[PDB]
Amino acid sequence: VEVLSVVTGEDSITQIELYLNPRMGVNSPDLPTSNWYTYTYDLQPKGSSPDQPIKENLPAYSVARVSLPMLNEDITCDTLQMWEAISVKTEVVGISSLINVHYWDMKRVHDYGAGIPVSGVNYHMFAIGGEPLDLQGLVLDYQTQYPKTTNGGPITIETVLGRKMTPKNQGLDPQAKAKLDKDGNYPIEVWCPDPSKNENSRYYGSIQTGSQTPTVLQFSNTLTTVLLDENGVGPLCKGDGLFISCADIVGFLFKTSGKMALHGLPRYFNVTLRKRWVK
Amino acid sequence: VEVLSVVTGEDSITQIELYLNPRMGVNSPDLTSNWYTYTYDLQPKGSSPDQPIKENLPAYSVARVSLPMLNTLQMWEAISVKTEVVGISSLINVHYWDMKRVHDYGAGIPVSGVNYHMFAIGGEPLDLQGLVLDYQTQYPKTTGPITIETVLGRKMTPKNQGLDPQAKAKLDKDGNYPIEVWCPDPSKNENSRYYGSIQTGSQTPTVLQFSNTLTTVLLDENGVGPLCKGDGLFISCADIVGFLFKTSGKMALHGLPRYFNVTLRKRWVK
Amino acid sequence: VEVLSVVTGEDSITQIELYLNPRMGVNSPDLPTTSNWYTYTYDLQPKGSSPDQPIKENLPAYSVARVSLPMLNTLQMWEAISVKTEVVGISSLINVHYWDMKRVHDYGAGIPVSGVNYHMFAIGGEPLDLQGLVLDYQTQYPKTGPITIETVLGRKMTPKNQGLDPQAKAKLDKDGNYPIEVWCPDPSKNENSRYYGSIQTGSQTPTVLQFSNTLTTVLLDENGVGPLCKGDGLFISCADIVGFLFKTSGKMALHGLPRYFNVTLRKRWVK
Amino acid sequence: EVLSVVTGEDSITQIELYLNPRMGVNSPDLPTTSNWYTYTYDLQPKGSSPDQPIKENLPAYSVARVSLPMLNEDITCDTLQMWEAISVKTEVVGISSLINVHYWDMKRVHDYGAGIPVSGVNYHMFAIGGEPLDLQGLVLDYQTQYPKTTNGGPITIETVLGRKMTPKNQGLDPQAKAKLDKDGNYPIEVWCPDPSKNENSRYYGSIQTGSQTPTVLQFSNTLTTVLLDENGVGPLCKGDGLFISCADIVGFLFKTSGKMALHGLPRYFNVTLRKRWVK
Amino acid sequence: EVLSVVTGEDSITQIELYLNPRMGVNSPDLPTTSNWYTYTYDLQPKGSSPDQPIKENLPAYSVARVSLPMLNTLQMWEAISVKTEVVGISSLINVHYWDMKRVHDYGAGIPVSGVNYHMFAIGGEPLDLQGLVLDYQTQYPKTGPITIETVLGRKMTPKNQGLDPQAKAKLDKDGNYPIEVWCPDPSKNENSRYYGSIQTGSQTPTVLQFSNTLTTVLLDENGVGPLCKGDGLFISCADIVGFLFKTSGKMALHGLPRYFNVTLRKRWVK
Ligand SMILES: CC(=O)N[C@@H]1[C@@H](O)[C@H](O[C@@H]2O[C@H](CO)[C@H](O)[C@H](O[C@]3(C(=O)O)C[C@H](O)[C@@H](NC(C)=O)[C@H]([C@H](O)[C@H](O)CO)O3)[C@H]2O)[C@@H](CO)O[C@H]1O
Ligand SMILES: CC(=O)N[C@H]1[C@H]([C@H](O)[C@H](O)CO)O[C@@](O)(C(=O)O)C[C@@H]1O
Ligand SMILES: [Cl-]
Ligand SMILES: [Cl-]
Ligand SMILES: [Cl-]
Ligand SMILES: [Cl-]
Ligand SMILES: [Cl-]
């Protein structure tokens, strides 16, 4: 997979724009329950063993594969052009919507007060790759009984192993590995990016725990992420496909009853790519 | 529009100064004006639906600045800006007559909690994307703030809790675009620069800086700043600085004004 | 004033040292009657009925000094090029055993000085330009005592003074006289001054401060010019509120610390 | 004496590994107790003197020695080639797992609410060296009776001194030194890196105390730590051994009863080494 | 006058030391009270005036003078850089001190947290100190701690709540100068470098870093480090890391030792 020179010429640079809507558990706006689109259901400890969480309570990674302009007339040549992602402008959309402290069923911060704003657990990541993101499985509790389904979601450790989790899945088990190849099917609480692979991807992420911790976010269209590695090489899109992945949990909606649901926001991407000779 | 060379000469540079007063809900000091720079009391009803009043919807400030007329032609290019939140010091006041106390015999709870800060400099209106916390929120009809129902010509659906590419607007009117409804559209705004932050929480400290030594460069990666179409410079902002906590337990958001000093140069364009 | 070249010669550079003591409300230590509360306010409380009629002891104000510089005289002016500045006495805030300190819980230590912080300093060749803006326009500040928006306008504040009112302007020409809660630096003026500040609200928010004698602030603008001292006077201004003293009864007073300055100045030709 | 970097073909090599946390329950393989793998047991003040902590409540450092390819045919020569560690990409794995706020026995934040997220005390460090990490002993309370090493306990200050601790071990006792040469046997609360030694190691660490303090962690495969010193020399691997140490405490699991247990996450390393001539 | 840096074979030396914290119980070698070494006694507002704090409740600065090899227009050692580290940070993960107050019933102990104070100084003479106290009516013990009364020879007046030019001392004795009374004097200390911070609050997270890759450069703006008068290097510090919370509700401040490795070079001076 030898990288040669950057292609020179007129249309050697292109731009790819897209947005990814969050997949928090209620993943569709088009259902007769869709009122909770971009939210989970109510998150509660069961109180007895074992936990059997519902799919609505399992926020999942967003992913899209973007098809790119075909570059090579004869694909049997050793030396071909490939799209190389060199930079990205990315932004969490709808941040301002979180100033709303008057949702009708918001728990009031104290008697007669404004609602507790969306706050608490945050998880924020994005990835740009020339192939699916590689995932490592690890869970808080190996005894958790994740939903078994027939329609390909959610995919968890039991799904990939073809057998029950054992205690080692609370740590790093090299067999618990997957590719982020489907939108809204790989739960955040089960899968993280695999740092031992992903040579052809760049990812950036953070978590914030706490129950009412401030959600603190910036947005600016002046911010650019360079996607080049130390050798000056960005992700190379094999099969003329650009993989874009993300997750943006922005906190809890505090309901009057005391119930709490996690909330997510969409993410925008503008990826600059260039043509690169490879061998 | 292809960008040519920067113009050289004696009157090549100019500086535009302005301030923008906050539009929190009570938007005029010349009327109920006692609550100017504040909302009314923000309070989840406990029952459905939510029908917020106009006084409870903080909105973006905006001004179009007419620039000296110039005229393949010359356009004004915004190259840098000094901007500052004005009146930050007023927030040390912990003795508002009706301020809720931190405890018995204590000082008032200081303005703190939800902050939202943004400013934009552009050569056309700021492009907005609509997204709401709850699509069932019934905003007042435009007679009146502009919201998603106004632009769509029909009610919101669940998709307006996410990114609906139809929910788009332009920031063309001062005090009319609710902050909780509209955010800068990153898919557009090629000819504007915007910078913003949010801080959620109820008594989360308000932490702000001020200095006249701080400059924001508005040039893009190619060395080109926003280009002022029809000789109009668009200046937009929002500066929510937290809640005024009242004795009863009621709470209102508060805003502060923003000052701008924009440096512009003449630029040949085709 | 057109700025020419930096003067060359043996004694073209001078250094100015000073400290400013905080003006928190009880502004003097020399009153045998009430100076125990020097560097603090009195007890800050919401009145519970309208209007607020705050006392002078509850209005922290800016510190100011004009420093006389050597007479030089198209003429020469002193140009401030850098400053080393420090909040003095930061270590005193480890004391959690003030005799009347509200305890964190039963048998525990005192609540340390914490909560509202406001820190700013300014160096200029003339008084700092101030913009007026208050939380509540119906506040009835003491008559001139402190100089407030009502003082400069010669009439009662109106709602517009809760936002930016271009008539609500003053110069910081008097020590301990301009209430911090009324006045902020005017960013529309102050071309011949450099100012830096911040605020932190919240009731018990940690007071977090640094101090080092290795930190210099460069005062030159984007054109390599520092403030130029009109009539050979250097103006230094600051405020350093460091949080609340929490008292047993529930009462709370604001506290401030002093600030030190070492300003480096050079001679500059101007026209 | 350090001489010149070796110029040649296979002059650079990469070493990949992960270390699973040793929080107290250190094996996933034990017949009965292993469900608490990556956790401590319940942490409690005894209420009477002295503290007599159990193994399971004493998080320890992770460590591995990695065998490097043999470089010298003749080991008698004055001048030899050694592996020199020059950079490392390291990442805490499984960070996303901490969004789980529905552990079956999770203490709620309030009635009907979600579980208190894993939060509070954090401790994070990693070290890359050419020899075992040098340790310095210091404890909160010198009267603490750690389980005896001979009884199958961890190695602590008493172990190294051959006698009981005295009040001076609440400060810096220059005789309370050890080397990190054993996985999950040196307690974090007893041993910190020794700054008076470790010339042939690079270490980086932080603590965060408080009970429900947000756990704030980042992850990216774009972040590289440079291991070179001020003279441009990285750790030199004695006996062809690369020493890799870490500790990643990420907070408390809050249980319904009020009981609390600390939790850790695994850490991944990718160390780049080059060949170096040494006299 | 500072001349040229000495060139030659043995011109650079390294000085290594550590300093144990002087929180109040200053010695590990006492009959029955050393169990609290590196801590204060219990800190408690009396509820009546005046405060009469005990020496066990007054954390003080650590200081050492290191003798450097003799050299003698003369040569002097010049401190050019330091690696410094707070040792024992990992010990603070212990949430099971036998008498630790719980966060809630059945819970773990409240971790060491709250007030932090961190400072270090390297110089060629003793650090210059400025006196300032929260409460000038505080009755400190006589000499033993050295406080403002000791140095003035008369009672503190209200001015000592601010900056009193007469309230000055030199940090010449280990564990004798209370932190709550003395801070580094910025009006002197030309021949020292000092770096410090405070963090207030009762349960504020203790957030500390440690790494053997961090170096502080000690040279001033002219490239000159502290010059060691009479071949003596002065090293001073303080590291309060927060409170130990006891079951009863009582609280003690706690400190940690600090390590130093100073690089010095020979410098010609007239
Ligand atoms: C059956 C009965 O009533 N017995 C009591 C016995 O409990 C008591 O001992 C004291 O009990 C209290 C209970 O809150 C504390 O546990 C005392 O311990 C501490 C404290 O936390 O207050 C421990 C702390 O470390 C000590 N501080 C220092 C600096 O050493 C303090 C301190 O010495 C005391 O508060 C005195 O200032 O004590 C514990 O001593 C005894 C003795 O009072 O009386 C029996 O009748
Ligand atoms: C500014 C000041 O001196 N405040 C003091 C007040 C007032 O003397 C009286 O309340 C009269 O208003 O009295 C206290 O006992 C109190 O209530 O806590 C102590 C406090 O320091
Ligand atoms: Cl995050
Ligand atoms: Cl913000
Ligand atoms: Cl501040
Ligand atoms: Cl940490
Ligand atoms: Cl600190």
Residue numbers in the entry:
A (entry chain C): 40 to 71, 73 to 319
B (entry chain D): 40 to 70, 73 to 112, 119 to 190, 193 to 319
C (entry chain E): 40 to 112, 119 to 189, 193 to 319
D (entry chain B): 41 to 319
E (entry chain A): 41 to 112, 119 to 189, 193 to 319
What does the primary publication say about this deposited structure?
The human Merkel cell polyomavirus (MCPyV or MCV) was discovered in 2008 and found to be clonally integrated into Merkel cell carcinomas (MCCs), establishing it as the first human oncovirus from the polyomavirus family. Polyomavirus infectious entry is initiated by the major capsid protein VP1, which attaches to cellular receptors to promote internalization and transport of the viral genome into the nucleus for replication. MCPyV VP1 is a symmetric ring-shaped homopentamer with the five VP1 monomers arranged around a central five-fold axis. Each monomer is composed of two antiparallel β-sheets, which together form a β-sandwich with jelly-roll topology.
We next determined high-resolution structures of MCPyV VP1 in complex with three different sialylated oligosaccharides derived from the in vitro binding partner GT1b. In each complex, electron density was only observed for the Neu5Ac-α2,3-Gal motif that is common to all three investigated oligosaccharides and is also present in GT1b. This disaccharide motif binds to a shallow binding site on the outer surface of VP1, which is formed entirely by residues of the BC-, DE- and HI-loops of one VP1 monomer. In all instances where ligand was bound, the α2,3-glycosidic linkage between Neu5Ac and Gal adopts the same conformation (torsion angles of −54° and −6°) that is preferred in solution and that is also found in complexes of mPyV VP1, hemagglutinins of influenza A viruses and wheat-germ agglutinin with linear α2,3-sialylated oligosaccharides. Neu5Ac forms the major contact point with MCPyV as it contributes most interactions and is best defined by electron density. Most of its protruding functional groups are engaged by the protein. Its carboxyl group forms a salt bridge and hydrogen bonds with K299 and S297 in the HI-loop and water-mediated hydrogen bonds with D145 and S297. The Neu5Ac N-acetyl group faces away from the fivefold axis, interacting with residues in the BC-loop. It makes hydrophobic interactions with the side chains of W76 and Y81 and hydrogen bonds with D82, which forms a salt bridge with K295. Furthermore, the O4 hydroxyl group of Neu5Ac interacts with Y143 and D145 in the DE-loop via a water molecule. The Gal residue does not contact the protein directly and exhibits elevated temperature factors, but can be docked unambiguously into the electron density.
